[PDB]
Amino acid sequence: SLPATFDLTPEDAQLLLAANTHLGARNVQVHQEPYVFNARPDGVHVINVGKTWEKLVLAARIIAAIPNPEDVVAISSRTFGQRAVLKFAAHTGATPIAGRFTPGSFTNYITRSFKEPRLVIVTDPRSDAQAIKEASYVNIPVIALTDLDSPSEFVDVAIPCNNRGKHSIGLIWYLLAREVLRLRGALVDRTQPWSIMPDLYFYRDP
Amino acid sequence: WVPVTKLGRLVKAGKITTIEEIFLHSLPVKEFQIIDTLLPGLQDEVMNIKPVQKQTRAGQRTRFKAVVVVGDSNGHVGLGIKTAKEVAGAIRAGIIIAKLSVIPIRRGYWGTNLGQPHSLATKTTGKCGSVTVRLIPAPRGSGIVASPAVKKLLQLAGVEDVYTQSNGKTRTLENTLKAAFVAIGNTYGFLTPNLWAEQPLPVSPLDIYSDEASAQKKRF
Amino acid sequence: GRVRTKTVKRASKALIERYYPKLTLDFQTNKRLCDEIATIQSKRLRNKIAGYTTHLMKRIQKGPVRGISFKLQEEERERKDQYVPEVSRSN
Amino acid sequence: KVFIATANAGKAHDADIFSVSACNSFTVSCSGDGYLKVWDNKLLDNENPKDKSYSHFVHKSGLHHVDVLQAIERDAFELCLVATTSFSGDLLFYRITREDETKKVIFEKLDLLDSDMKKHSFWALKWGASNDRLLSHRLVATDVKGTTYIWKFHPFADLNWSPTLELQGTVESPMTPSQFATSVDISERGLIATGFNNGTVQISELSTLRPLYNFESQHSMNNSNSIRSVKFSPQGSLLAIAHDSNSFGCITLYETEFGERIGSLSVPTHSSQASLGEFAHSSWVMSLSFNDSGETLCSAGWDGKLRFWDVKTKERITTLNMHCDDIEIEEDILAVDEHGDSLAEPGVFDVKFLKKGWRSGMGADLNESLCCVCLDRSIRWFREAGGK
Amino acid sequence: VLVQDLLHPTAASEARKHKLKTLVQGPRSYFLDVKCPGCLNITTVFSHAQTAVTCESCSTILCTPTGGKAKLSEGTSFRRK
Amino acid sequence: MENDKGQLVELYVPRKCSATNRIIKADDHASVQINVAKVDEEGRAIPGEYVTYALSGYVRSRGESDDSLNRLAQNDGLLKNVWSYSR
RNA sequence: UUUUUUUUUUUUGACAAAUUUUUUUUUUUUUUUU
């Protein structure tokens, strides 16, 4: 097991709250996933956050286990998460796939978009289903920042988050980046919170 | 040659030795040269070619369609199908596809446990279209009891003694042979008693030396 | 009718991508610039290319066109949206 | 553009550090005192490399050249081979392996070659890392006579450990009388660049042991004609050489087929006294090194300044003075005092590129890494780019 | 789903389910002891009605029958015994 | 598999799914091999030292790899909570 | 301010019988003398 220092600290929790990551789904939590900390009156289901943190920690712990860091792929057709995935790509070794996916990015060369990833990470499995399905055919694990109502086909280590609002995705990706720096890298865990403000991530406006 | 894909490099640089290894970690073969390099003895067999006609405003696109079965007599075979506007090309690409999609065969004993396997391990069925193909373990000195195509496929497969039992419209070598391929394939995908012990799950050669044989650059 | 073809359009686009310095929004200057800048076979084709470049430049000035990017447009990356101090966390 | 510093280990050896090769896990460092010292590349950012240093006294005369080879062949056998030649001219091989739990580096010595061949006085050498072009790996070595020895190295031989060095060939001396072979290099394409002490560079193809062609000195007159460091671009045919004049440093570049020249690297203007001699460094160029990506070329001079040269541009990218503090601004020119040398007088020995992320930190995998060694014995490590 | 324990589930995910499709079948019908308005003494009554029950001694209405649970008329206290 | 004189054959013994214990045959390309890192003090990576988890293509297709993986991670020893044996 | 708005439709029957098509692996030079 991991040390006690790699747990959900108060400030991190506060940050998570500020975003509204814990906000789940209006219509349904699909029984695929049991990540609910009792529903709110006249609204959505609340997510067990600690669980989410633990999942993130795993995801990072899997990302670090991959030898070459640039064969991680950050999938994003979601306009909200494009800048996020770019920033994450810049920070980690990982390569980005912003905007349109273009089928056969994993299946079969000749195309220039042919990348052969060891691991794939996704923003949303609903909007980027083509990516996931492609990942099915060529032996790739998938790590999607899942919603509760959104589906769960072929997704491993699903991180239960809000993926509706701006302040959520950029946050999760940022956290992941921080973790993968804490693992395998320079930054100390407890003494250094890291002063790269999550305002760096998030969508454009305009 | 000049291989694309990560496997292509590994096979080229002499990292991956056997096809067994690839089979273990279940990595998808996209270049036909890989398997050729791995397994040299592999020989082809054009079972059947038939013409097929796309009817059109003017006349007919009479394109051919060849079924090629490749394999060596040591538990590896591959069925390949291809259509083309000429026969040669069709046969060629059929061989290609066949090499690409090779499968291993869990071949074992009838009952007695003596020097080297001879028949199939378990009773396997494969279906394709209307055709079903049940392959059954047979004792020593039984031989291949099947129709010509299937017989040939099994001769290539490296199976000595075997009973077969089919159903449906067998006059369509395509579907029959496909079913056979499926069935021989499903020999491994079937739980035996001797394979109940827990293995430690070895790490892939694609995982181990990724960095030392990744997609290179060197512009000059 | 008067629709510009593939080799005129694509090549024009390519030119704008790797020659944004120069290519001022006048036809005649571009016309000779094209003869200098790259080998073109016929006169007609060259002229067409020049015209399309002129058109493109004319419509680059008003806003950033989707498809083309010529390194001058790049800069907005780290300094993309640290934009608009609203002027007069909790609570 | 700019190269940020990761760390620097001061007072490494007793005598001068001559050569410094690198691999996936660690940088090997030879020296004049007689120790072989490996230094860990996997460092935790805020740490002195002395903490992960492992010494091994090999020969009292000292070690001027050393070369490393880290690779896998059968399943997952982490073959790390360190070969070295002492000041006595004695060839020694060492396989480097760590313990399972403790992680203590065990310097297991190897005597693969017989005593008849170890007798010969060697100098420079290099490992040609094969990729199934040869069945196993390749090795080259120079000597006092110029009879450049080449070995078809086999680590396995029916899989179980059984290392042998079968002799590929011996490319004899270029001219009679002979010349002292100063430097050597081998490429993946299969060419043997042999450097000599009179500005001569003998190029030999690997297959038939035949000389393809050779260059001569640019200087026709002595004012330091000798070759410093022959080097190849990894895949491509571009071939890099370094020679001097009367106390200067000059880089020269050629193509690997026709032998047509392409560019002498230089810097002009007034502080070099107008400058008839268009030279690269104000003092001798002690080391050259291509990066693993191909384009861009490093060059270390005795004057202190690491000049970086883009081979596409045929012009300097940037300088970096290793010994003395000279960052930020750069009014770039060769300092030529009327006596002879520049006013800058440090002692550089060697420089070397490392692949995109063999280090660990913020400057790791994002960027490539840079290694270098000095006369004061303060071995250094530098990150690159600074844009990630 | 896939892998779970059905021997010890939760009271949360069992009290919700039907009487017949629990692990051990059991009714959802406690017994109640009503204190009537007239008399001071109790009346032991089953929570579900079926018939319209009146009091033991001073015969007046206690609980009327409905589609399910008994309709206890007016202000009358009760227990779960 | 072992013939008369012991002596193992049956070229290549295949993997098993960590969840279902179903055989991961060659052509099953939907199947996955997760590789997880083992940490030390101050977390950190430790390169070349992993814990593997093989998952069948079928389960992924069905869309309940998540849960079983969570279980696998919990009972082995790299989490608390997350998965629940009593649903 | 779920929100605009639409109007219809003849007659044309037939065409003699027989009448295309099929194969598998791939490969080109010339020149004596001192």
In chain A, the number of structural domains is: 1
Say how far apart CA B184 and CA D316 lie, in whole Å: 64
Say how far apart CA D5 and CA D212 lie, in whole Å: 42
> What are the structure tokens assigned to D282, written together?
């104000």
Q: Report the alpha-carbon angle A79-A85-A90, nearest 5.
A: 140
> What are the structure tokens assigned to B156, written together?
């290539």
Distance of CA D114 to the CA centre of its chain: 27
Phi, psi of C42 (to 5 degrees): -100, 165
Say how far apart CA D113 and CA D153 lie, in whole Å: 10
Question: Residue A5 domain-assigned?
Answer: no
Contact flag for B and F (3+ C-beta pairs < 8 Å): yes
CB D319 within 8 A of CB D280: no
Closest in A68, A138, A139 to B210, CB measured: A68
Structural element, H or E, at residue D309: strand D306-310
CB A75 within 8 A of CB A194: no
Say how far apart CA B203 and CA D145 lie, in whole Å: 49
Distance of CA B139 to the CA centre of its chain: 24
SS3 state of residue D336:
coil
Residue F40 is classified by DSSP as B
> What are the structure tokens assigned to D292, written together?
């693993």
CB A23 within 8 A of CB A39: no
SS3 state of residue F1:
coil
Say how far apart CA D187 and CA D237 lie, in whole Å: 9
CB of B43 lies under 7 Å from some atom of strand G: no
> What are the structure tokens assigned to C12, written together?
């024009």
Phi, psi of E35 (to 5 degrees): -95, 110
Say how far apart CA A133 and CA A131 lie, in whole Å: 6
Question: Residue A80 domain-assigned?
Answer: yes
SS3 state of residue A56:
helix
Q: Report the alpha-carbon angle B31-B32-B36, nearest 5.
A: 130
Say how far apart CA B13 and CA D187 lie, in whole Å: 16
Other residues' Cβ atoms within 10 Å of the Cβ of residue B25: 22
> Cβ separation of A156 and F60 shorter than 8 Å?
yes
Residue F53 is classified by DSSP as E
SS3 state of residue D108:
strand
> What are the structure tokens assigned to B121, written together?
């391990």
CB proximity list for B148: less than 8 A, separation 6 or greater = none
Closest by Cα among D245, D288, D237, D299 to D262 = D237
Phi, psi of C77 (to 5 degrees): -140, -70
Q: Is A180 on the interface with D (CB under 8 A)?
A: no
CB B187 within 8 A of CB B126: no
Residues of chain D contacting residue B218, judged by C-beta atoms under 8 Å apart: 233-236, 292-294
Residues of chain A contacting residue B211, judged by C-beta atoms under 8 Å apart: 67-68
Q: D355: buried, middle or exposed (CB in 10 Å: 19+, 13-18, 0-12)? A: middle
Closest by Cα among D380, D315, D312 to D351 = D380
CATH architecture of F1-87: 2-Layer Sandwich (3.30)
Closest by Cα among D282, D278, D280, D284 to D297 = D280
CB proximity list for B206: less than 8 A, separation 6 or greater = A118, B6, B7, B10, B25, B27
Closest by Cα among D192, D195, D196, D194 to D209 = D192
CB D346 within 8 A of CB D303: yes
Sheet holding D348-354, edge to edge: D5-9, D379-383, D369-374, D348-354
| Tokens 């950190």 -> residue | F44
> Cβ separation of A116 and B30 shorter than 8 Å?
no
Distance of CA D324 to the CA centre of its chain: 22
Q: How many residues does chain C have?
A: 91
User: What experiment produced this structure?
Assistant: cryo-EM
SS3 state of residue A17:
helix
SS3 state of residue A65:
helix
Other residues' Cβ atoms within 10 Å of the Cβ of residue E37: 15
> What are the structure tokens assigned to D112, written together?
């693969």
Residue A40 is classified by DSSP as P
CB B198 within 8 A of CB B174: no
Say how far apart CA A152 and CA F82 lie, in whole Å: 17
The pairing of strands D161-171 and D137-143 is: unpaired
Resolution value (Å, 1 decimal): 3.8
Q: Dihedral of CA B80/B83/B85/B87: which sign? A: positive
The alpha carbon torsion through D48, D52, D56, D62 (nearest 10 deg) reads: -30
User: B 10-39 residues with CB below 8 A of F?
Assistant: 20, 22-26, 28
CB proximity list for C77: less than 8 A, separation 6 or greater = none
> Cβ separation of F67 and E2 shorter than 8 Å?
yes
| Tokens 């600690």 -> residue | A50
Say how far apart CA D145 and CA D249 lie, in whole Å: 26
Closest by Cα among A64, A51, A58, A22 to A39 = A22
**Gap from F7 CA to chain A (nearest CA, Å):** 33
CB D301 within 8 A of CB D320: no
Longest dimension (CA), chain F: 54
Q: Which residue of A has its CA nearest to C89?
A: A18
Q: Which residue of A has its CA nearest to C90?
A: A18
Q: Which residues pair with D306 in a beta bridge?
A: D300
Tell me how far CA of residue B24 lies from CA of B20, B41, C77, F55, in angstroms: 6, 21, 45, 14
Say how far apart CA D295 and CA D287 lie, in whole Å: 17
SS3 state of residue E14:
helix
Distance of CA C14 to the CA centre of its chain: 9
Say how far apart CA D13 and CA D178 lie, in whole Å: 35
- Structural domain harbouring A43: 10-200
Interface residue of C74, C81, C90 to substitute, partner A, most A CBs within 10 Å = C81
Say how far apart CA D18 and CA D28 lie, in whole Å: 11
CB B155 within 8 A of CB B182: no
Tell me how far CA of residue D120 lies from CA of A29, D92, D117, D141, D145, in angstroms: 78, 12, 6, 11, 10
> What does the H/E/C string look like for chain B?
CCCCCHHHHHHHCCCCCCHHHHHHHCCCCCCHHHHHHHCCCCECCEEEEEEEEEECCCCEEEEEEEEEEEEECCCEEEEEEEEECCHHHHHHHHHHHHHHCCEECCEECCCCCCCCCCEECCCEEEEECCEEEEEEECCCCCCEECCHHHHHHHHHHCCCCEEEEEECCCCCHHHHHHHHHHHHHCCCCCCCCCCCCCCCCCCCHHHHCCHHHCCCCCCC
Domains in chain D, CATH or no CATH each:
1-388 (2.130.10.10)
Say how far apart CA F86 and CA E8 lie, in whole Å: 7
Q: Which residue of A has its CA nearest to C80?
A: A204
CB B35 within 8 A of CB B102: yes
CB A201 within 8 A of CB A84: yes
With residues binned 3-state (H G I as helix, E B as strand, rest as coil), the percentages for chain F, rounded to 5, are: 20, 25, 55
CB D307 within 8 A of CB D316: yes
Residues of chain B contacting residue D295, judged by C-beta atoms under 8 Å apart: 219-220
CATH number at residue A173: 3.40.50.10490
Say how far apart CA A93 and CA A97 lie, in whole Å: 14
CB E58 within 8 A of CB E36: yes
Give D293's Cβ-side CA count (13 Å radius).
Answer: 14
Tell me how far CA of residue A174 lies from CA of A52, A81, B67, D40, D279, in angstroms: 14, 11, 53, 30, 49
CB E55 within 8 A of CB E46: no
CATH annotation of E1-81? 2.20.25.100
In one-letter notation, the amino acid at residue C15 is L
Say how far apart CA D93 and CA D106 lie, in whole Å: 14
CA of B60: nucleotide with nearest C1': G20
Question: Residue A111 domain-assigned?
Answer: yes
CB of B53 lies under 7 Å from some atom of strand G: yes
> What are the structure tokens assigned to D101, written together?
């739990």
CB D336 within 8 A of CB D273: yes
> What are the structure tokens assigned to D191, written together?
């060419």
Say how far apart CA A26 and CA A19 lie, in whole Å: 17
Q: How many residues does chain B have?
A: 220
Q: How many residues does chain F have?
A: 87
Say how far apart CA D171 and CA A27 lie, in whole Å: 80
Task: Domain ranges for chain F, please list them.
Answer: 1-87
The pairing of strands A119-122 and A142-144 is: parallel
In one-letter notation, the amino acid at residue D263 is G
| Tokens 């290539």 -> residue | B156
Peptide bond just before D214 cis, omega within 30 deg: no
Nearest-10 crossing angle of helices A169-182, A49-65 = 50
Q: Dihedral of CA A103/A108/A113/A118: which sign? A: positive
CB of B44 lies under 7 Å from some atom of strand G: yes
Say how far apart CA F70 and CA A158 lie, in whole Å: 10
Sheet holding D91-98, edge to edge: D63-71, D79-86, D91-98, D105-110
Q: Dihedral of CA B80/B85/B88/B93: which sign? A: negative
The pairing of strands A36-39 and A45-47 is: antiparallel
> What are the structure tokens assigned to B31, written together?
């270049």
Q: Dihedral of CA B10/B16/B19/B23: which sign? A: negative
| Tokens 């033991």 -> residue | E56
Say how far apart CA B100 and CA B27 lie, in whole Å: 12
Residues of chain D contacting residue B219, judged by C-beta atoms under 8 Å apart: 236, 293-295
Closest by Cα among A50, A7, A63 to A177 = A63
Tell me how far CA of residue D330 lies from CA of A191, D305, D307, F50, in angstroms: 38, 11, 12, 48
Say how far apart CA B11 and CA A70 lie, in whole Å: 22
Say how far apart CA B119 and CA B137 lie, in whole Å: 5
CB D31 within 8 A of CB D18: yes
Say how far apart CA D300 and CA D242 lie, in whole Å: 10
Say how far apart CA B46 and CA C30 lie, in whole Å: 62
Say how far apart CA D259 and CA D274 lie, in whole Å: 31
Other residues' Cβ atoms within 10 Å of the Cβ of residue B81: 17
Q: Which residues pair with D169 in a beta bridge?
A: D150
Peptide bond just before D234 cis, omega within 30 deg: no
SS3 state of residue A181:
helix
Say how far apart CA B13 and CA D299 lie, in whole Å: 32
Residue E37 is classified by DSSP as S
Task: Domain ranges for chain E, please list them.
Answer: 1-81
CB proximity list for D319: less than 8 A, separation 6 or greater = D305, D306, D307, D308, D326, D330, D332
Q: Which residues pair with E34 in a beta bridge?
A: E43
Domains in chain B, CATH or no CATH each:
1-104 (3.30.160.20), 105-198 (3.30.230.10)
Q: Is F76 on the interface with B (CB under 8 A)?
A: no
| Tokens 């494969």 -> residue | B126
> Cβ separation of B207 and A118 shorter than 8 Å?
yes
